[PDB]
Write a protein that binds this ligand. Structure first.
Ligand SMILES: Nc1ncnc2c1ncn2[C@@H]1O[C@H](CSCC[C@H](N)C(=O)O)[C@@H](O)[C@H]1O
Length: 392
């Protein structure tokens, strides 16, 4: 119950002689007051910081100097994968995030702390100054139009979330008001952003997206990575760190070989479209219809020639490609896809993953070795990292 934190575990929690301590730093001198058990482990729920570590300044690592965050990620990857992996710093570590979902509740605007309690905020520094402006306009909108907001105790109220998105390289901003059934007052006199959306979440789930009801201004905003534009819709996924996303698409384009590329699990075509712009012959697949539709829209606005189709990893053919890129969901690569890759043996596989343990698992099953690998800090202030591996 007393001692110095020696390291962080893989979720970012301080390790003191096999008790866990959240938001602690190696080198912290602490006294553990209260313990609790979380999945058969002792977790320090009340502790006293006696001496602060010199490493100190979802953001569970935000109390740590950035260089130490990167050191923690290097060490974690080496533990999981078995060897040193370079970690590329995010070009920016505040203002880098291009989407935030703010809950709008009786007792404040921000996010759940103690799930029943809201943390009220005036700005979100990882998103940047646009959030301060949106929040301040939102308060005026709510106040002057007397808008009913979420009462979390009863789960009643009209307005639930304000989701803010922006293109870091285009300066376009989209705001999306997610509500229950109702009538949203005209938001046009309160916001000056390029796109304003009203979405109605008609399910019982607490979610920060819903059915598109109306938009004012642009139907889509854009983000731009180098010379490639990507349409952003309230309901479509896009890498959340625009600055690192630039390094990620460049890195993928550098690792592929040949001319014929498969962009497997393409989503909205982040890799495939960038590669088509660079002159590759690209086909991409994803099981999500809406994502594929966005990828097709992206092909059009960039005037490239690439094809995207909806298919499951259980069925996709990998025949006839020079490089196959895979960016699988949390489950990793379907076993049938691994069999197909083993049989067809494309010259190069590029595997992108923010789940190092699943990557490590799948690579053992593939008849390939790691030729090159780097991690990109896509997720500053969290324990997560994005790996990009070239397999041959
Ligand atoms: N069983 C399956 N078969 C094919 N696609 C799947 C799948 N399960 C999930 N997906 C898709 O797998 C993708 C993983 S995220 C991939 C991100 C994409 N490369 C981008 O840059 O934006 C998602 O787009 C998801 O819709």
């Amino acid at each position: 119950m007393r001692g110095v934190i020696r390291k962080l575990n893989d979720d970012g929690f301080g390790v003191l002689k096999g008790i866990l301590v959240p938001f602690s730093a190696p080198g912290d001198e602490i006294i553990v007051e209260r313990v609790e058990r979380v999945k058969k482990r002792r977790v320090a729920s009340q502790w006293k910081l006696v001496r602060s570590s010199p490493l100190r300044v979802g953001c569970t690592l935000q109390h740590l100097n950035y260089d130490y965050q990167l050191e923690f990620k290097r060490k974690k990857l080496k533990r999981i994968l078995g060897f040193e992996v370079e970690v590329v710093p995010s070009p920016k570590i505040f203002g880098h995030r291009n989407r935030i979902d703010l809950a709008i509740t009786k007792d404040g605007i921000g996010f759940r702390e103690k799930w029943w309690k809201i943390v009220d905020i005036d700005e979100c520094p990882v998103f940047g100054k646009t959030s301060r402006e949106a929040i301040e306009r939102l308060k005026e909108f709510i106040e002057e139009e007397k808008i009913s907001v979420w009462n979390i105790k009863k789960d009643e109220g009209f307005l639930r979330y304000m989701v803010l998105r922006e293109g870091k390289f285009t300066e376009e901003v989209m705001v999306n008001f997610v509500t229950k059934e109702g009538n949203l007052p005209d938001p046009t006199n309160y916001f000056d952003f390029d796109s304003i959306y009203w979405s109605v979440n008609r399910s019982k789930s607490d979610v920060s997206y819903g059915d598109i009801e109306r938009f004012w201004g642009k139907e889509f905003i854009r983000e731009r990575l180098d010379d490639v534009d990507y349409l952003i819709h309230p309901n479509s996924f896009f890498q959340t760190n625009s600055y690192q996303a630039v390094n990620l698409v460049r890195k993928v384009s550098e690792l592929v070989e040949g001319e014929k590329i498969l962009d497997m699990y393409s989503g909205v075509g982040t890799f495939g479209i960038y590669l088509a712009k660079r002159g590759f012959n690209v086909k991409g697949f994803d099981s999500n219809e809406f994502a594929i539709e966005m990828a097709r829209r992206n092909v059009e606005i960039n005037n490239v020639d690439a094809e995207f189709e909806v298919a499951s990893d259980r069925e996709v053919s990998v025949k006839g490609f020079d490089t196959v890129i895979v960016d699988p969901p949390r489950a990793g690569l379907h076993p049938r896809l691994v069999k197909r890759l083993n049989r067809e043996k494309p010259g190069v596989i590029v595997y992108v993953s923010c789940n190092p343990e699943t990557f490590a698992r799948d690579v053992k099953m593939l008849d390939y070795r790691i030729d090159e690998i780097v991690a990109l800090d896509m997720f500053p202030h969290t324990p997560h990292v994005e790996l990009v591996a070239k397999l041959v």
